[PDB]
């Protein structure tokens, strides 16, 4: 799992606690607080970050949340994301040039979200089979993880089991499907189906969350992430945004 | 209709598309710079290396006498040679997963329409260039050194193809990989054996001013797009080098 690797948390604290480039703002603070407004007739007291790799969104999330769950699949995003919420700082690689690296401090207490982190509980967990205990949440909030799936029909045809009435599934994703993450036949958009006919992924949502959740809105959110001191992933995510029906 | 692959239709894209992010189109960039760097040589013959599908060449071709591009991928060369010869090609952009938006590209539809005809392209290694490609005025190769597996063998011997007074510009983001250079062909990006870190900028100066002055460095930002919605954003630093 690449997930798993050293340089993926070095990767991923750099992207949520680092500086923001070429004028994009950090990723899980815009999607936090666009959740926390398209929420905001909702009791707020229970809210899961699906996929929360170190966590920023999860720490953002409870300034407004009683409770937050911050669930990955990677043990080595939940220890970074741990080790910051009870140690206070963790460390971590930034690339440069070549093999070169730049070791960098995220410091909790440097951040707005130092008066709510002890609302949030990290844990290892699959997506695509959550256990029992994470339920009855407000808000689930799965940014840019169904095109990281296996199978991601096991998450989306189940979650509104895991949302109160009322509750809010907020999504995002750039639909960059690739075999390595999910064999194509489970792609949700994406491709040519046997018919012809080219399916995009938010119709291919629509027709999965349709049967429990109305589409409330949808819009686009940059996002850039660091490679290397010159190279960049400069990407434009859909957030949708669905209402448990 | 001419019909460009994938690898050649994102260079395609990137060279002949629209701007993205509000960058500036990189190829048009790069020999803009150029020829604002060379402005008091005399303007006979550039060379563009690795010009893959050519954009830079046509762009060159609007100051200089002769443009040759040259290229290792023939496939590169025959878009550019076919977009010159016909006035037009045609490539799959890439969307969501595996779906494609087709687009052609039309010669008239650009400012270098006026030159083309001065641009010859070749198939051909940096690290092994025919005799024959000699005696330029600008040698330019940009985001070519760090995709050679051995740079230094282009890069030493690349003066005695640069008249007097002549010029070197390169560009690189210096991305070392060991998947195209071996590492103790890397020019920079390292940590040496005495535990200091090696610039690229550096190294290249080790090698190059043997024969060159160092004249001006800027960084030159491109945007090359994947898909619909994911997109490389990279700074390049381009160095510029006079021939002693
Ligand atoms: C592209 S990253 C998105 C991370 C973060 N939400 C963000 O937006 O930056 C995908 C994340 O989903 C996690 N992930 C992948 N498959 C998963 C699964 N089956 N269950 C839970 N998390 C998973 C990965 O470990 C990674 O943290
Ligand atoms: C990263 S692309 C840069 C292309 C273009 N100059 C630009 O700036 O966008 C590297 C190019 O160099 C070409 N190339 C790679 N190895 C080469 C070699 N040994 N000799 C000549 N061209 C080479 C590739 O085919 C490709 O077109």
Redesign the pocket.
């Known amino acids: 799992?690449i997930?798993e690797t050293d340089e993926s948390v070095s990767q991923?604290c750099d992207?949520?606690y680092g500086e923001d480039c070429f004028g994009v703002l950090n990723?899980?603070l815009a999607?936090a607080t666009k959740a926390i407004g398209y929420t905001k007739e909702t009791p707020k007291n229970r809210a899961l970050?699906?996929?929360?790799?170190t966590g920023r969104?999860s720490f953002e999330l409870a300034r407004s949340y009683k409770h937050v769950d911050g669930?990955?699949?990677?043990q080595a995003?939940v220890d970074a994301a741990t080790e910051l919420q009870k140690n206070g700082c963790i460390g971590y690689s930034q690339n440069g040039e070549g093999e070169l690296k730049n070791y960098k401090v995220i410091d909790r207490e440097g951040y707005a979200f130092r008066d709510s982190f002890t609302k949030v509980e990290f844990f290892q967990?699959?997506?695509?089979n959550l256990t029992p205990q994470f339920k009855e949440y407000d808000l689930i909030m799965?940014?840019?993880?169904i095109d990281?799936?296996?199978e991601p029909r096991l998450?989306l045809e189940n979650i509104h089991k895991r949302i109160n009435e009322k509750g809010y599934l907020i999504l995002?994703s750039p639909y960059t499907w690739r075999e390595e993450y999910t064999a194509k036949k489970f792609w949700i958009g994406g491709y040519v189906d046997e018919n012809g006919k080219e399916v995009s992924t938010l119709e291919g949502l629509k027709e999965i969350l349709e049967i429990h959740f109305e589409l409330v809105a949808t819009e686009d959110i940059p996002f850039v992430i660091r490679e290397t001191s010159r190279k960049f992933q400069h990407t434009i995510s859909q957030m949708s945004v669905w209402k448990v029906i």
């Open positions: 799992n997930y991923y992207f949520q990723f899980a999607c970050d699906l996929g929360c790799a969104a669930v990955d699949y990677s995003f967990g699959d997506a695509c799965a940014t840019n993880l990281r799936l296996y998450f995002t």
